[PDB]
DNA sequence: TCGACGGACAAAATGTTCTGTA
DNA sequence: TACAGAACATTTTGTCCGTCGA
């Protein structure tokens, strides 16, 4: 956890 | 002082077909109209029509004829959408090897996974998107991913040929003979609706980029989003921006409203396209006996989406009712 | 089938180190010998295909270098269907007075009633149909009337022109421009599907004659017909007859096979095209606000039909699934 | 023998001038 | 004076078919 989408979303 | 052709900007001869055009654009128009010509654009429906490049795109020259009205630095929101538009990916397909239904679908699922990794980057670059809540940002990408990828597939397939073919990647194009075999006839009919509609409508690059952004803002949760008021403002910003693209495309055509009707009617029909594509996707994913592979990126989305479409936890946003 | 590595046209040889066709060979030789400071109206990535290779000489020359260039009466069953084919009826429309949404829809209803007069007579003359019981005859025409008229409309439009038209009568053709207005938009999308597929498939007249017959035999009662055993031999015979027409086209067993698949998929998709044309016909018939007039011939069928769709009393036949 | 040059011819696409008519 | 279609014309592309080299 979390999803790879969540991980990729907050990754600046 | 030299009066210029409103089509190619070459010394005009007079007021030909209502517009102050030069002798050459005047005869080009009369030929293209009565020659009932089917001109296909090699670019993205917005080639520069000037004295040197008027011979280049006749599809665009006939559009700049109609946008003039013939008959018998400061970056704009859409200029940003162009700049953030993702680079086209390769399937890495071994085309010099025998093909399979499983092999093509697995390859395509893997390509769609890379496309999602790109569409998330593209999404963050949309002014306003990173301004919504994270649970909304994820929901928008989860709801509109097939919509995004199929709309982009339609553009890639539109651009690649006038023939019915699905240009998934430069190295994975499925020709009409292959898409009509029973193994993939029905799935290809939905993906082909997009490229044929973009074709019919002569959708310009500006109109396309705006519609693609609106596809990201086309579906919301049944009980709304967390930053719903901001979402509505952003959605309405890009509808105003699509209208600006239609004004640029039509120019003096008078059919700006009619154009908007058709493009928004297409934006609406994308829900039906996606609903069909998703049904094959979920069905295949859950079918263990098929044993087709799906990437970790997509399989997480699909698994966290299947019990949401069935539970009516989606509010499909439509322009037309 | 060697492909030109520049425009994908059938290659003629290995010209200037690259497998290219005749045209790209001489274009390349000209683009280096001539000073040719070619300009791109697009974004320097225009698609170079056989039809659009003339378009961007800058991208074509760019692509050339990127590739590597450098220096007995016996009547047939089908011929009976051809002879029994009814002659095209005129709408009785007057282009003289202005166009109207009421005038168009109502004139088409009157034309459809007159066309239903010939639809019944044409059915009587079908080898085998005259053998069926009177209520199976009257019911088969009731279940599949919209199927016949829409398929014949699709056929008339396909034969009329390569353009997106709807050819209801020789004196009443609704061009693309007119059917994209909201009053006609959604319903015309379904009427146009038929001609869209007839063009795509290049359907022959003998293929059309068998297909139109298979459409009259495409919808039976959910509790079966009275002359059901007889019905199954007639239907089977016309399926075989369709295959005879497909053979008269190419002759390659796999080509012939996929052609049958595609044509049967078309006959199948017709149930969905009828489904959507009935929905708008029933909405305009039951709406007192509408005022669109239906002739006594068509109104009689519509009154009988609406409670049959509400009671699921129909067993739509499908070649696939 | 085979296959690719390139000129000669040809076709297609585009442009200019001429002439009829308000 | 003007603009529209025709007449003439130019430019750009594409085909045929020898000749000739490996
Ligand atoms: C019908 C589904 C939908 C397919 C996806 C459509 C999407 F537009 C897309 C575009 C691409 O450029 C690459 C991949 C996807 C994301 C997609 F094509 C693939 O995942 C495969 C999907 C799910 C789908 O495709 C087919 O049947 C299909 C396409 C060509 C032949 O068969 C599948 O369900 S395959 C198993 F999921
Ligand atoms: C949607 C309905 C269906 C239309 C008929 C379809 C049929 F195939 C047909 C073919 C013809 O060659 C001539 C007439 C009919 C029988 C038909 F076109 C008409 O009567 C009109 C029908 C009922 C229909 O069409 C339209 O929406 C329509 C056609 C043009 C614009 O809208 C109507 O319901 S008209 C409302 F009465
Ligand atoms: Zn001009
Ligand atoms: Zn163009
Ligand atoms: Zn070529
Ligand atoms: Zn170009």
């Amino acid at each position: 956890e979390p999803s790879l989408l969540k991980k990729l979303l907050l990754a600046p | 002082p030299p009066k210029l052709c409103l089509v190619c900007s070459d010394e005009a001869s007079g007021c030909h077909y209502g517009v102050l055009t030069c002798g050459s654009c005047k005869v080009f128009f009369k030929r293209a109209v009565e020659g009932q010509h089917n001109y296909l654009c090699a670019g993205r429906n917005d080639c520069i029509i000037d004295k040197i490049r008027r011979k280049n795109c006749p599809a665009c020259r006939y559009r700049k004829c109609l946008q003039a009205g013939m008959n018998l630095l400061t970056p704009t929101l859409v200029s940003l959408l162009e700049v953030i538009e993702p680079e086209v990916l390769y399937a890495g397909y071994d085309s010099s090897v025998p093909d399979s239904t499983w092999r093509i679908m697995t390859t395509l699922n893997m390509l769609g996974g890379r496309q999602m990794i790109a569409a998330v980057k593209w999404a963050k670059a949309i002014p306003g998107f990173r301004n919504l809540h994270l649970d909304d940002q994820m929901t928008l990408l989860q709801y509109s991913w097939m919509s995004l990828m199929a709309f982009a597939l339609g553009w890639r397939s539109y651009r690649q040929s006038s023939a019915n073919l699905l240009c998934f990647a430069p190295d994975l194009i499925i020709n009409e003979q292959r898409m009509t075999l029973p193994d993939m006839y029905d799935q290809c009919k939905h993906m082909l609706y997009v490229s044929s509609e973009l074709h019919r409508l002569q959708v310009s690059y500006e109109e396309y980029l705006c519609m693609k952004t609106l596809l990201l803002l086309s579906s919301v949760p049944k009980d709304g989003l967390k930053s719903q008021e901001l979402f509505d403002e952003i959605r309405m910003t890009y509808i105003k921006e699509l209208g600006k693209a239609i004004v640029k495309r039509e120019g003096n055509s008078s059919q700006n409203w009619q154009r908007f009707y058709q493009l928004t009617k297409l934006l609406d029909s994308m829900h039906e396209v996606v609903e069909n594509l998703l049904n094959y996707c979920f069905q295949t994913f859950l079918d263990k006996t098929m044993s087709i592979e799906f990437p970790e990126m997509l399989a997480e989305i699909i698994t966290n989406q299947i019990p949401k479409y069935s539970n009516g936890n989606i509010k499909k946003l439509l322009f037309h009712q």
Side-chain angles (χ1 to χ4, degrees), chain B residues 40-42 44 46-48 52-53 56-58 82 159-162 164 176-177 180-182 185-186 189 193 200 205 257-258 261-262 265:
Chain B
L40 188 63
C41 186
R44 300 157 169 89
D46 50 31
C47 303
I48 299 161
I52 277 184
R53 306 180 274 190
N56 304 45
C57 197
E82 179 178 350
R159 265 213 94 207
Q160 188 53 44
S161 197
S162 65
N164 316 282
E176 205 206 271
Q177 117 74 31
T180 58
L181 283 157
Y185 181 114
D186 307 311
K189 285 290 150 307
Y193 173 81
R200 178 186 73 86
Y205 200 40
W257 192 79
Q258 169 72 72
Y261 179 75
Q262 269 167 297
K265 245 294 168 34

Side-chain angles (χ1 to χ4, degrees), chain B residues 29-75:
Chain B
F29 183 78
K30 173 62 179 251
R31 278 161 185 169
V33 173
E34 74 178 347
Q36 247 176 223
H37 287 317
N38 171 39
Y39 288 130
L40 188 63
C41 186
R44 300 157 169 89
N45 287 332
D46 50 31
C47 303
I48 299 161
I49 310 301
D50 65 343
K51 190 172 175 65
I52 277 184
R53 306 180 274 190
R54 51 176 185 181
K55 297 209 192 203
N56 304 45
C57 197
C60 280
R61 190 190 190 179
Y62 181 70
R63 268 309 309 164
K64 202 167 172 211
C65 272
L66 297 169
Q67 68 194 136
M70 293 180 74
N71 180 84
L72 316 185
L73 292 168
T74 73

Side-chain angles (χ1 to χ4, degrees), chain B residues 262-280:
Chain B
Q262 269 167 297
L263 295 182
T264 65
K265 245 294 168 34
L266 165 61
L267 279 175
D268 280 1
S269 67
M270 284 299 302
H271 289 332
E272 184 133 4
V273 175
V274 177
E275 226 214 25
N276 290 306
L277 298 177
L278 283 177
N279 291 337
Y280 290 111

Side-chain angles (χ1 to χ4, degrees), chain B residues 198-210:
Chain B
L198 296 176
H199 181 264
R200 178 186 73 86
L201 297 173
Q202 279 250 290
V203 176
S204 72
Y205 200 40
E206 298 213 342
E207 305 170 327
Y208 158 76
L209 303 158
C210 296

